[PDB]
Design a protein around this ligand. Sequence first.
Ligand code: MG
Ligand code: MG
Ligand code: MG
Ligand code: MG
Ligand code: MG
Ligand code: MG
Lengths: 125, 410, 282, 94, 99, 121
Amino acid sequence: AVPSVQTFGKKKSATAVAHVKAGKGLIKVNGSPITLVEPEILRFKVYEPLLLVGLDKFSNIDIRVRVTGGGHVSQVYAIRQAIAKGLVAYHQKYVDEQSKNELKKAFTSYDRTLLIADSRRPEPK
Amino acid sequence: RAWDLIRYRNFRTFTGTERIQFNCLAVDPSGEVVCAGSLDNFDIHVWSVQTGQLLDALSGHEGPVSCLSFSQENSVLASASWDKTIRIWSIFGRSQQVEPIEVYSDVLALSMRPDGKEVAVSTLKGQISIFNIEDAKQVGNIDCRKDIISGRFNQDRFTAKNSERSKFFTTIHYSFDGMAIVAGGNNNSICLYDVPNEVLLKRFIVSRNMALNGTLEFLNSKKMTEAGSLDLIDDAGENSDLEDRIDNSLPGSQRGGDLSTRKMRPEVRVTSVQFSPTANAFAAASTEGLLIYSTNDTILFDPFDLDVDVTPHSTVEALREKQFLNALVMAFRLNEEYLINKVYEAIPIKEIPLVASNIPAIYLPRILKFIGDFAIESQHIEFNLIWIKALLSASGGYINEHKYLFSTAM
Amino acid sequence: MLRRQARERREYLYRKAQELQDSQLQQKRQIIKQALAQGKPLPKELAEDESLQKDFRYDQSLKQVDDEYAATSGIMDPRIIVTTSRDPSTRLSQFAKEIKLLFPNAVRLNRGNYVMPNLVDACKKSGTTDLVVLHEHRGVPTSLTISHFPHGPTAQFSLHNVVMRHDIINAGNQSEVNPHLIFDNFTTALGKRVVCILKHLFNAGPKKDSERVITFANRGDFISVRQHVYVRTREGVEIAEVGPRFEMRLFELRLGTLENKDADVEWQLRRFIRTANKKDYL
Amino acid sequence: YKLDVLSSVHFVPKPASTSLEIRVETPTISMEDAQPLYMSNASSLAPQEIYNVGKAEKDGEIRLKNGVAMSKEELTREDKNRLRRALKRKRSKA
Amino acid sequence: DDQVIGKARSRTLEMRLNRLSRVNGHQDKINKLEKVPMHIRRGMIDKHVKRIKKYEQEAAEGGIVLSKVKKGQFRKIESTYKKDIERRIGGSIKARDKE
Amino acid sequence: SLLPPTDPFRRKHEQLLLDKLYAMGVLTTKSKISDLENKVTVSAICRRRLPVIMHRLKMAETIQDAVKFIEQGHVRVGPNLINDPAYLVTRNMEDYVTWVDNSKIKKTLLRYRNQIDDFDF
RNA sequence: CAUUGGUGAGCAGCGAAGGAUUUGGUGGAUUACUAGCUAAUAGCAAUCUAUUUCAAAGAAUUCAAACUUGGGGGAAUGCCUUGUUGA
RNA sequence: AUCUGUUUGGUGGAACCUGAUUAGAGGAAACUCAAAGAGUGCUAUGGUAU
RNA sequence: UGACGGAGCCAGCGAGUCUAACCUUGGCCGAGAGGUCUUGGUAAAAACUCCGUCGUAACGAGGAAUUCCUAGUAAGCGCAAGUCAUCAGCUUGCGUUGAUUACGUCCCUGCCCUUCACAC
Ligand SMILES: [Mg+2]
Ligand SMILES: [Mg+2]
Ligand SMILES: [Mg+2]
Ligand SMILES: [Mg+2]
Ligand SMILES: [Mg+2]
Ligand SMILES: [Mg+2]
């Protein structure tokens, strides 16, 4: 069986399911490449993981992201969270754990939201 | 319960309204507030030391509280739970505030930076995560699952490698300098990590006894038969005396009773670990007792900033030529105790205040450490007190600016 | 917790079921006790029941506020959150503040996009004892629901003749002392249940000379609510209204939090029964 | 004991109760275990516990907790009233 | 009632309940002798009769006056109260009473 | 029982004994004192063993299958793994009985509902 | 259009007198290596036993001896304790 | 027929209720090893022993 | 911080064989009741992103005074349901976009409370 890992990203009602499998850097969102993700203005947000850890690592994997729910902004945040978590999970399972540590450190250095859900749970005062 | 060591009187006792068992406690630096946590109430109780009244119950955790700690400087309270969360309570002040930070998995232990600026937490996943209190953002992470050595118990039916019994650290503590973490768990290893570079400085084996259950990863194949492990066979009846044959064991007990009750071999496990406030040593409580590891012996040659011209012969010549300041400095660069001790005792009293004001600041921590370890058991008390009077008067301002470097020495 | 709350409720429901089954046995023991003291013979069924007589020797040694409140009755002061429905009008926001001043230990919380399961769960984490939600119609309060945590009850009320304090000129500020409580003309078993719910929103142990009194007067199922400040004169008592005035009529009471629309109904107002007009339940 | 050990000592604590304990003055060293070392040499009772300034033995005198003693003869009339009022409030609180 | 402790409290409570029940409870159900095999009970009855005969004969030869007993019933000597023999042998032999 | 009924000491200790046994889960009700003899049985203790409680919590199909998972090191109580199938679980600790994080069983549960996230594992 | 579903038919690429999966048996390790037997200050190891017996030592009124029992009520006949009768 | 939608048979077996059972329920092999039950066959024949 | 048009695209609640006009013009069949057809009038996801065009009597963002409000809060947007009380001149839910400023002080204005060690 081809190596594959699965991850979820969530933001408000938006939920994104990412499958990361051995491949050739074929990355798609809802059956289309990333470059067509909308709104255009926030597209680089979805690019945040790709650019941080370098495109070289993605050159050996294919990522399929399927996203449902929420609005535009929450959809984008779900996408980026799903991509980051999937990349780290695959690097853990089928690559050295040293690269796993490097990936986690880079991501948590930039913005921890890529890895931990951002749940603004109510707090009474 | 609060104890006074001067008169050994239990000068006060606190108890919850709901009759709740307590597993973790923390004490304010001012010694005026005491907070305890429970594995049954999901809240942190608070009491005022002077009055004994239950000041308030802090709520907000959706799981049992596992560890607490106060910040020695900022006086905030950090509490962690099995809720996969950590909460920072600013109990003191006109306004109470709570700042939760989420974590990947269950939190078991917690350690507070002496500066009070960061907190480390050991998770069930086998991670030591360091967070910055004021910013509430992660600053580091250290993997620990691979380092932890865990053994196969005799009763177990699954390998130690596949075992998930104890691949996490149930206790951690900082070094007072703040650059090192010593960790221990329900396992056969005490690991010492270095915070700034997130690397394993050294690992220690707690025990090597086969009377304890968890010492060995791989157990001898010969011990089985078609029945099973030989050692699981109870041979108490072979004991000649009656008291050895009698079994008082309760079937399901795990802890909290005498050795006879549990019926199973003790398991190697480190409940707590701490660094010595005054010496470069740490103590780890285990089943066999408090194993105290120390660096006192110091047979290692750990020179600092040598050159070809520095040599044990040369420093003796610098002493004979009455170049004390050089002689003392070259003593530190070699960093040999017997050589330091000689140069320390040969400096005449008239020359101590001049030497002290001219010791390079970089070596100031070393001399203060040396005076401390030497003075406790040495006989030259007035000689030492003359030195310390000289050093503190000369370099008191520097010591003040960098407290957490000179804390253990001071 | 979520596992904790679920199992606690399950045991409590199981306790009720057994207690209803135990009700017959309790009376059987009461008869045996009376027979021993008086010397009167026992009824036939109890006479031939050997198991009960053996049990009686142990159960000879046996001996108020409602069960949800019994644990904390008079120990822990209630914590109250007063909120409103989504996008409140200004008047409801003003009235919600008045209710907050009514209960000494109340806090006002804004409901902008808070989801009800999130609202109740958030309050349960923080140890909130009671949650109050107010509705409105064209800036006129209409409904009030009181939901006791962690497991109910949820009591729903409808407001009539609502007169807020902002409708007064130069009224001044309120007194927030722990006020005395007056509950008048609550007779039926349901009436006690409502007194039990309304009583525990307040802090226990007002000072004997406390100068604020809150009265809930039942008059044909319409609980008049008034707040007065009094001065003991040499020849009687003189009182002044602080407000607000309003009339509450219960129309639901459920064994659960207000979130649970499936919670059992302890009592409901039947308006289309033929004999509705005749009897007053409270 | 059997039940607590059986439940792995995750029992529920007993309800609180209040009891009286008597403490004998003794050198602190005695209370320690037997070794060639002592940690503290103070007494087992605090200085208040040995003696606390209380009532005036002579009815005429007035004695306060701060140690100030007063005979009723010296006191001017206003002081007597002031002290009597002070007594009234102290008794009322108790 | 508040002072009595020990077996006296247990035995006394049982006797009271029997004394209250017997009007309304059917005779067969209310008093059931505990099951004991044949050869034991006949031994217990035989001896309990033997002590009663000795207790009666000793009183008769002396002047002692004894409380009256119905013809069928066994006289209730001190041994009956201590040894709790009544539950086992019963007050009287029912089969002879029926005949 | 033999102590007099209105005795305050008899009041206190029987209440204490029920509360402890009820908390341990041996007794399901704390109302009647008579339960101490009628309703205290070995099975009342056995039902609180970890194999039985998982079966009631539906974590296994049968008590035999619940045992096999304990000896296989799948079951945890709190953060402590347990291989003893005689561990008595108080009422309170029934709530923390859960699978081990990396357990293949949790992988099947989450895979069956298509809710598996490999980051957590 | 997608299968990270199954079953097959073929390439590219890897590629020294073949490759891949599963399995039975034995051996060495899994604690830190001072030799076997016996009647053991030495014999034997092919055993003697046709000297292997004698002598010496060795016996608590402890003449005590279930620390070993699921709870409740009893115990005819047993058994324990105590007293008694007659030898 | 981008008609209609009831019926017969097959597939599947939510909730409630009822009954039975419970170290879950089954299956296959035999010149295998055991512990039992029933039936049947056999001059199965010393009334007092060549 | 517009209008018109086109294009792209994102939610969550909600499932009772139950869900929904009025007033007319005439033809035919029918004993009647009525049935059918014909006929005119009246009523009855959004934000967002991209592209193209135009172009900047009363009233033009609301005085004095007064009220409310601290994070998924204020504010903007639509979509559902109408749950024995209240509501359609509307009420209640649901998701979407989502900030600024404070989180200190008892200075003013109100309300309230007070007068078992070591050390003080
Ligand atoms: Mg404030
Ligand atoms: Mg709004
Ligand atoms: Mg709106
Ligand atoms: Mg509204
Ligand atoms: Mg093999
Ligand atoms: Mg017995």
